[PDB]
Design an enzyme around this catalytic site. Structure first.
Site, mmCIF file in Angstrom:
data_model
loop_
_atom_site.group_PDB
_atom_site.id
_atom_site.type_symbol
_atom_site.label_atom_id
_atom_site.label_comp_id
_atom_site.label_asym_id
_atom_site.label_seq_id
_atom_site.Cartn_x
_atom_site.Cartn_y
_atom_site.Cartn_z
ATOM 1 N N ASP C 330 100.693 -6.982 24.489
ATOM 2 C CA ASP C 330 99.344 -6.441 24.500
ATOM 3 C C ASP C 330 99.403 -4.928 24.372
ATOM 4 O OD1 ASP C 330 99.493 -9.018 25.926
ATOM 5 O OD2 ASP C 330 97.316 -8.790 26.091
ATOM 6 N N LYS C 441 83.035 -8.372 25.620
ATOM 7 C CA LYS C 441 83.453 -7.075 25.090
ATOM 8 C C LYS C 441 82.370 -6.008 25.237
ATOM 9 C CE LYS C 441 86.357 -9.391 21.635
ATOM 10 N NZ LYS C 441 87.562 -9.369 22.505
ATOM 11 N N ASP C 671 97.907 -10.480 31.957
ATOM 12 C CA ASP C 671 97.516 -9.904 33.237
ATOM 13 C C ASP C 671 96.141 -10.391 33.679
ATOM 14 O OD1 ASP C 671 96.164 -8.489 31.238
ATOM 15 O OD2 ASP C 671 96.001 -6.697 32.485
HETATM 16 N N1 LIG Z 1 85.133 -1.380 30.974
HETATM 17 C C1 LIG Z 1 84.688 -1.648 29.743
HETATM 18 N N2 LIG Z 1 83.355 -1.694 29.537
HETATM 19 C C2 LIG Z 1 82.904 -1.960 28.310
HETATM 20 N N3 LIG Z 1 83.599 -2.201 27.197
HETATM 21 C C3 LIG Z 1 84.913 -2.151 27.428
HETATM 22 C C4 LIG Z 1 85.530 -1.887 28.640
HETATM 23 N N4 LIG Z 1 86.910 -1.917 28.506
HETATM 24 C C5 LIG Z 1 87.091 -2.194 27.238
HETATM 25 N N5 LIG Z 1 85.929 -2.351 26.527
HETATM 26 C C6 LIG Z 1 85.805 -2.652 25.105
HETATM 27 O O1 LIG Z 1 85.931 -4.052 24.928
HETATM 28 C C7 LIG Z 1 86.971 -4.336 23.972
HETATM 29 C C8 LIG Z 1 87.645 -5.633 24.336
HETATM 30 O O2 LIG Z 1 88.738 -5.339 25.229
HETATM 31 P P1 LIG Z 1 89.694 -6.479 25.755
HETATM 32 O O3 LIG Z 1 89.586 -6.693 27.207
HETATM 33 O O4 LIG Z 1 89.410 -7.728 24.930
HETATM 34 O O5 LIG Z 1 91.142 -5.974 25.336
HETATM 35 P P2 LIG Z 1 91.395 -4.451 25.793
HETATM 36 O O6 LIG Z 1 91.181 -3.529 24.619
HETATM 37 O O7 LIG Z 1 90.465 -4.074 26.974
HETATM 38 C C9 LIG Z 1 93.117 -4.303 26.364
HETATM 39 P P3 LIG Z 1 94.271 -5.100 25.245
HETATM 40 O O8 LIG Z 1 94.176 -4.533 23.872
HETATM 41 O O9 LIG Z 1 95.669 -4.896 25.864
HETATM 42 O O10 LIG Z 1 93.967 -6.612 25.284
HETATM 43 C C10 LIG Z 1 87.871 -3.111 24.012
HETATM 44 O O11 LIG Z 1 88.579 -2.953 22.790
HETATM 45 C C11 LIG Z 1 86.868 -1.978 24.230
HETATM 46 O O12 LIG Z 1 86.317 -1.513 23.006
#
Ligand SMILES: Nc1ncnc2c1ncn2[C@@H]1O[C@H](COP(=O)(O)OP(=O)(O)CP(=O)(O)O)[C@@H](O)[C@H]1O
Ligand code: NA
Ligand code: NA
Lengths: 298, 255, 937
Positions: C330, C441, C671
């Site tokens: 990830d 998301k 995780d």
């Molecule tokens: N706290 C939050 N509130 C709102 N949107 C969020 C957020 N944290 C992340 N996002 C958005 O939601 C998208 C989806 O994130 P997701 O949980 O699916 O993977 P991630 O990018 O958070 C970590 P990884 O890439 O390791 O899986 C993120 O790419 C970001 O644009």
């Protein structure tokens, strides 16, 4: 870009500062290994083309050994009173003599131990450390017996090369062994080299213990700075760094065993070490508007 | 198992060649080391002489079973082996074989020192009819077998006092044993022994024991016990070694 | 037995336990209650009395053969001392020696097994199971053991429940009660009484289960032994291969023992002598302690990788982690530091920069624009992150924040630019909150606006920039709402391409003033079945924050490329950001091109691009939902560098199954609660030790103590050093069998006095017993371990014909010849030269021939010969053992009546038995057999 001599507090140490534009930004303190000097340990790395992105953004210092870099005054009786615990604690006067707020130190070998001890004594003057081939453990007896029984008749340069470079690396010369051996023999004199080696042979065990989740808050003496442990995959100090990787908070420390290197990662593989240092500094809020290396050259 | 019932898939020839070469190299190393170790040893005297400190005792000829001599006064094939062994052993002791040897004074160690190393004479006439000069059969045909008792040779051993072999019959001492020479006296002029290489033509002293089986007690089993008496140097009591300065044998002359 | 607080209402809980249900009991009261009840998670099982574990080592296996031999020797000496007066004290000493041999072997087995047990039990204490409690007003995370009956405990998604809770506050918790109820389907939990049976009501959550959705709050009522759970009470390929090898070699040993027994009976051995010879030559030949040695190797490697922040939960993970051929990782947290700082904004049709150092506003921009005011308000309001109330004198950026890294970066940026985020949230009270979810998301919230022209309800939204723009109808420019058109949307996509092309995580922000005539002051706002107009919002702007890669990650990806490990990046971030990060860390190395990259290098449309010309791809998550099973195989088979972007946590299972259909050994990273099926389907499930859920740490086979991708590669490298160190131990176990069986064979063949007896055969086996364990204890490392293609565990055998041919015939023969040299020298220095000994076996060993002549003319009685023979036997044994240990030391240094060891010109001793060793280690070196067991020379 001037060479400065610090006030005689428990000795005098020569330092070299490459500029003072910081004001508030931290500086990059340095400390070479035993038998070496900054012009032979960090000069070959900070002048690298990839390192110009960092050197022009931070003030780079070069704290030499309690001996000398240019010339060889030495001491008549020697009397190496400043030990590693004593060498670490003479840094705050150096910082106050140059109006340095905090330092991102990077030390190699004994310099790494000195920086670690200084951070332990004063966990406020250092923001992060890059400990190259750090060894926070005394020689004990298991390796102490082999360090002198089979090496009663052994030149000091041979001892230093064994300490730095790997067994096969010194067994088969690649002209890097020759270059660094002539660097050790010339330039820095033998007397202060032997005195520094004798001082470093003591190496009282540094007090570091990995925090356990919710139980050892009563007793814990781990570094509070962002640590970056560097060691080549083919060096005799791998076990020392892994021992330092353990007993160290795995939330800020980082272990880097570089693949195609060994001995001194600062000179053998500079282009990867500078990238690692840039990524390590970038996560501390520094050089944010930089370029991510390997991104198709752009 | 298989079309050829074997595993020789073009292999087993290369394996054989490799192991031949490897074991040839190993045998070469072992042989050279053995030779270079042997070059450090003397050819005349052992490096260590502390494992054979005192002489044992032994009887001749060696019987088929243990040290039990058994034969019959009548059948000549029952004691043919004894006669042949005794005659073959005593050949270098005869008159025509000791001619080159020298004659030494009695009752004193013949401590030679110098690259000559002459050997004294042991006259076969000292055995007094337990030799083959009187009767070709060594008393076996008559019913009075003769047996030789010898002291094991040790290089450089000098017995002190007056050595003597004391043989006593244990079968109620009815067939009183006859010991030659005299009372089993071992003379000191045959000592020390200087080795197979230095002491050329060395003939060791012998003691001949004749047990006389009377017709009344013919067919019994006489147990004879000999010891090296008279010399404190030569041990004769030991719990483990039953032949250290001792020898026991059983003689049975079937009627 | 029910005895629960289900139907007991909330007022009695404040009385039955003396805790107020808003701040929990105080620390002193908690400690006092803990002192009289014990730790929460006691659940103590029984243990073996630790003397049965020693008696099983003494009397067990082939030690029973030595016990039988000792009993036979004692019986023989008993009948001897009965029948004959003053017997020989030989059978008694033989029995004592055999008994000492079994005792020492059992002691070694015990202090080899109760060291691996200690190492393996040390791991269970590395990650204590914690709990979140509310003591003294604030929340303090403590070890689950410190939890006591009556304190307030908060649980959330992916949280193992510390103990039996009486739930008093909950919004959506669904516990997984499969541990007791059997059914694994989540059951909702609410603070109200719902069923008579405690096991079926909704206001109680049970111990050892975990809430998998939402959060809840409860009062601990029962601890470990009193809980409802406390009231109620497969062979790895390496293990199978070693078991089969041990069985085969044991059969070989028994055959050799039987044949030697028969041969010795032919050579006029007494029955008590031949039987002991059989039971000694069988015991010395079976590979006793080989399973102990491999257990020591596995536990040592597990200990050494745990020092490198890789915590394995079993020893089967150690051997599987060395066979890895794919790593699905990830981006955020694992491949990047997860320490983000806001660096760019895009609210108007311009990219605006941001910087630290509060003075001068940071670069050139300030609160002049109402668009920036609205964007900062959205960023501050939608954040759940709060500064920890400490370190006030410390700089705003150099602070401690509790929350997501993106939310922490936004909070720090808003505090530096605007300031007073806490008071800003105070002004806009949060009516309802929709937490961020990986499936949605986005994060949604509704706040109360004390503004003048306010419609009394403010809607705040943040999330994925493209998932937010699909529900936005207007774009706010200079404070004026303009219709969202293709003039602004293409500019938005260009801004995303520029900010995202630098490896910067971008978030999209939008709002909507909820109309008052549709949403009055007391309008119903329920999280379930939302009624607010989620569609048709007002876009405000974008914020991009840098997330640097971890320092050791580019080198780790380089190592993975050097080996045959195929790294796959599975992320939920945008394809632009994912592709930029993958290129930055080296997952998509220079030279490799995507289809969209080779459609731009030469200007042709994507549809005309030959797919086989591209070895790197970026696969969108939506494009993976409609893919067939066979269509995913084309992605994984033909592309050597794959990035899965915008992929939900529930598609990791699809990816892992597709990778495993390729015959790979997949290590996956997770995780969260949704990652659990992938962590269990993957061959190695890796959980983040820092920010990983309890559910994932339960599903995982390994825990990353630092959430660092480089640690996975370091653990793979450490576990690769498990088969080369295992065949070393097998060879060292087998090397001592030829020095023990060759003396009798040469005895028979050459008719020499016996070089080694069957007391020193057991003494050799006893002395050279811990050598493999010490070898793998002193093993340092290898060199090309990470330049080697992954092991094929199905079709790669630990034991081959070259290892057996090595041990049984190249090292054992050298050792045997060394012992023979020692025997020959001892005999020759007492008078019996080597050429004299040939054919001397029958005159020797004859107790009635007491005038045996040596090479010097002397004559020896039977006992005088036998003392020298005993010396030769003991010297043979000493030489073998000493040379084995010295060879161990020399090999670990060069490449990464006991006459032996004497100085007085005793080069016959260990000196030569090791000199042949060192003289053949050079010839095997020079011959240089490539296919390469030139090591074990
Ligand atoms: N706290 C939050 N509130 C709102 N949107 C969020 C957020 N944290 C992340 N996002 C958005 O939601 C998208 C989806 O994130 P997701 O949980 O699916 O993977 P991630 O990018 O958070 C970590 P990884 O890439 O390791 O899986 C993120 O790419 C970001 O644009
Ligand atoms: Na064994
Ligand atoms: Na063995």
């Amino acid at each position: 870009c001037q060479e400065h001599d610090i006030e005689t507090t428990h000795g005098v140490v020569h330092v070299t500062i490459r500029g003072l534009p910081k004001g508030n930004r931290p500086v990059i303190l340095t400390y070479h290994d035993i038998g070496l000097n900054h012009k032979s340990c960090f000069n070959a790395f900070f002048n690298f083309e990839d390192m110009q992105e960092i050197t022009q953004h931070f003030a780079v210092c070069h704290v030499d050994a309690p001996g000398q870099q240019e010339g060889a005054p030495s001491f008549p009786t020697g009397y190496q009173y400043p030990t590693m615990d004593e060498l670490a604690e003479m840094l705050p006067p150096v910082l106050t003599h140059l109006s340095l707020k905090s330092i991102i130190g990077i030390g190699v070998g004994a310099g790494a131990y000195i920086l670690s001890r200084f951070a332990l004594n004063h966990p406020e003057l250092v923001e992060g450390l890059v400990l190259i081939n750090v060894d926070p453990c005394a020689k004990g007896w298991i390796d102490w017996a082999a360090s002198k029984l089979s090496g009663l008749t052994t030149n000091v340069v041979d001892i230093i090369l064994a300490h730095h470079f790997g067994q096969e690396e010194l067994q088969a010369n690649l002209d890097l062994i020759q270059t660094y051996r002539m660097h050790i023999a010339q330039d820095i004199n033998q007397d202060n080299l032997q005195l520094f080696l004798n001082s470093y042979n003591g190496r009282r065990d540094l007090e570091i213990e990995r925090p356990i989740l919710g139980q050892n808050d009563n007793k814990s003496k781990t570094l509070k700075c962002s640590t970056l442990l560097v060691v080549g995959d083919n060096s005799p100090a791998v076990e020392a760094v892994v021992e330092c990787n353990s007993r160290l908070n795995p939330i800020n420390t980082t272990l880097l065993k570089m693949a195609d290197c060994g001995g001194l990662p600062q000179v053998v593989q500079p282009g990867k070490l500078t990238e690692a240092f840039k990524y390590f500094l970038q996560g501390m809020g520094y050089i944010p508007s930089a370029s991510m290396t390997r991104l198709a050259r752009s | 198992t298989g079309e050829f019932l074997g595993r020789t898939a073009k292999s087993w020839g290369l394996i054989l060649l490799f192991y031949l070469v490897f074991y040839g190299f190993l045998a070469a190393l072992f042989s050279f080391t053995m030779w270079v170790m042997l070059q450090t040893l003397n050819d005349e005297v052992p490096k260590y002489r502390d494992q054979i400190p005192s002489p044992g005792l032994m009887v001749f000829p060696k019987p088929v079973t243990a040290l039990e001599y058994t034969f019959s006064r009548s059948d000549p094939t029952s004691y043919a082996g004894y006669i042949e062994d005794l005659k073959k052993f005593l050949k270098p002791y005869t008159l025509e074989e000791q001619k080159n040897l020298t004659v030494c004074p009695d009752g004193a160690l013949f401590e030679q020192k110098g690259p000559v190393y002459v050997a004294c004479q042991f006259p076969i006439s000292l055995l007094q009819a337990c030799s083959g000069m009187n009767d070709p059969d060594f008393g076996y045909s008559q019913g009075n077998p003769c047996i030789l008792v010898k002291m094991n040779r040790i290089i450089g051993l000098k017995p002190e006092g007056v050595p003597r072999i004391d043989c006593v019959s244990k079968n109620e001492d009815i067939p009183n044993v006859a010991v030659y020479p005299h009372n089993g006296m071992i003379d000191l002029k045959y000592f020390p022994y200087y080795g197979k290489k230095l002491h050329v033509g060395y003939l060791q002293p012998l003691v001949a024991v004749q047990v006389s089986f009377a017709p009344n007690n013919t067919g019994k089993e006489v147990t004879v016990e000999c010891k090296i008496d008279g010399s404190a140097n030569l041990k004769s009591q030991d719990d483990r070694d039953k032949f250290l300065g001792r020898v026991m044998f059983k003689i049975t002359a079937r009627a | 037995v029910s005895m629960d607080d289900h139907k007991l209402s909330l007022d009695e809980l404040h009385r039955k336990y003396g805790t107020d249900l808003s701040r929990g009991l105080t620390s002193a009261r908690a400690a006092e209650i803990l002192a009289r009840d014990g730790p929460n998670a006691l659940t103590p099982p029984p243990t073996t009395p630790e003397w049965i574990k020693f008696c099983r080592q003494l009397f067990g296996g082939f030690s029973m053969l030595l016990w039988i031999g000792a009993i036979l020797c004692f019986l023989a000496y008993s009948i001897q001392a009965a029948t004959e007066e003053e017997p020989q004290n030989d059978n008694l000493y033989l029995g004592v020696v055999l008994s000492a041999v079994v005792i020492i072997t059992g002691c070694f087995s015990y202090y080899q097994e109760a060291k691996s047990s200690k190492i393996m039990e040390s791991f269970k204490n590395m990650v204590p199971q914690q709990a979140l409690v509310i003591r003294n007003g604030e929340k303090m995370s403590i070890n689950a053991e410190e939890v006591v009956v009556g304190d307030l405990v908060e649980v959330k998604g992916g949280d193992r429940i510390p103990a039996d809770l009486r739930i008093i506050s909950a919004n959506g918790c669904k516990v997984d009660n499969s541990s007791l109820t059997g059914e694994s389907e989540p059951q909702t939990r609410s603070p109200d009484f719902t069923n008579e049976n405690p096991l079926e009501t909704r206001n109680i959550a049970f111990f050892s289960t975990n809430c998998v959705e939402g959060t809840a709050r409860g009062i601990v009522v029962y601890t470990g032994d009193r809980t409802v759970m406390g009231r109620i009470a497969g062979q790895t390929p390496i293990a199978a291969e070693i078991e089969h090898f041990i069985h085969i070699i044991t059969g070989v040993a028994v055959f050799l023992g039987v044949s030697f027994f028969i041969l010795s009976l032919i050579l006029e051995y007494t029955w008590l002598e031949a039987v002991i010879f059989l039971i000694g030559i069988i015991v010395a030949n079976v590979p006793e302690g080989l399973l102990a040695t491999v257990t020591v190797c596995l536990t040592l490697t597990a200990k050494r990788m745990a020092r490198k922040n890789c915590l394995v939960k079993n020893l089967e993970a150690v051997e599987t982690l060395g066979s890895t051929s794919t790593i699905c990782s990830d981006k955020t947290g694992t491949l990047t530091q997860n320490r983000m700082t806001v660096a760019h904004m895009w609210f108007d049709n311009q990219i605006h920069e941001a910087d630290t150092t509060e003075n001068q506003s940071g670069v050139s921009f300030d609160k002049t624009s109402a668009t920036w005011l609205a964007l900062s308000r959205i960023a501050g309001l939608c954040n759940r992150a709060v500064f920890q109330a400490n370190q006030e004198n410390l700089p705003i950026l150099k602070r401690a924040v509790a929350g997501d890294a993106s939310e922490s970066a936004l909070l720090k940026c808003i505090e530096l630019c605007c300031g007073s985020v806490k008071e800003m949230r105070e002004r806009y009270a949060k009516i309802v909150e929709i937490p961020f979810n990986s499936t949605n998301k986005y994060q949604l919230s509704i706040h109360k606006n004390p503004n003048t022209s306010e419609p009394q309800h403010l809607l705040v939204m943040k999330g994925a920039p493209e998932r937010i723009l699909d529900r936005c109808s207007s774009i706010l420019l200079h404070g004026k709402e303009q219709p969202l058109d293709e003039e602004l949307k293409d500019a938005f996509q260009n801004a995303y391409l520029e900010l995202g092309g630098l490896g910067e995580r971008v978030l999209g922000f939008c709002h909507l003033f909820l109309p008052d005539e549709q949403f009055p002051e007391g309008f119903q706002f329920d999280t379930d079945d939302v009624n607010f107009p989620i569609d048709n919002l007002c876009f405000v702007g974008l914020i991009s924050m840098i997330d640097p890669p971890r320092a050791a990650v580019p080198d780790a990806v380089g190592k993975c490329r050097s080996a045959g490990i195929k790294v796959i990046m599975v992320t939920g971030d945008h394809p632009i950001t994912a592709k930029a990060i993958a290129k930055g860390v080296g997952i998509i190395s220079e030279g490799n091109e995507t289809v969209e990259d080779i459609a731009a290098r030469l200007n042709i449309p994507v549809s005309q691009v030959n797919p086989r010309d591209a070895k790197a791809c970026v696969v969108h998550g939506s494009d993976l939902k409609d893919m067939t099973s066979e269509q995913l195989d084309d992605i994984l088979k033909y592309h050597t560098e794959i990035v899965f972007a915008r992929t939900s946590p529930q598609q990791k299972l699809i990816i892992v199954e597709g990778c495993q259909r390729q015959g790979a050994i997949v290590a996956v990273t997770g995780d969260g609660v949704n990652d659990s099926p992938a962590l269990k389907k993957a061959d190695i499930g890796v959980a983040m030790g820092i920010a990983g859920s309890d559910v994932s740490k339960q599903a995982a086979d390994m825990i990353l103590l630092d959430d660092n991708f480089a640690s996975i590669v370091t653990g793979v490298e450490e576990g690769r050093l498990i088969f080369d160190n295992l065949k070393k131990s097998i060879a060292y176990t087998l090397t001592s069998n030829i020095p023990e069986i060759t003396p009798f064979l040469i005895f028979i063949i050459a008719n020499i006095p016996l070089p080694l007896g069957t007391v020193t055969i057991l003494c050799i086996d006893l002395g050279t017993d811990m050598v493999p364990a010490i070898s793998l204890a002193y093993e340092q490392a290898e060199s090309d371990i990470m330049k080697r293609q992954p092991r094929n565990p199905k079709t790669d055998k630990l034991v081959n014909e070259r290892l057996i041919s090595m041990a049984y015939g190249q090292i054992g023969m050298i050792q045997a010849l060394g012992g023979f040299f020692t025997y020959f020298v001892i005999l020759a220095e007492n008078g019996f030269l080597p050429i004299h000994l040939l054919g001397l076996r029958v005159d020797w060993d004859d107790r009635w021939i007491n005038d045996v002549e040596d090479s010097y003319g002397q004559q020896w009685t039977y006992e005088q010969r036998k003392i020298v023979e005993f010396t030769c036997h003991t010297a043979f044994f000493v030489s073998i053992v000493v040379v084995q240990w010295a060879d161990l030391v020399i090999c670990k240094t060069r490449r990464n009546r006991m006459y032996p060891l004497k100085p007085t010109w005793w080069f016959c001793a260990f000196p030569y038995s090791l000199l042949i060793f060192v003289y053949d280690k050079v010839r095997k070196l020079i011959i240089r057999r490539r296919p390469e067991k030139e090591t074990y020379y």
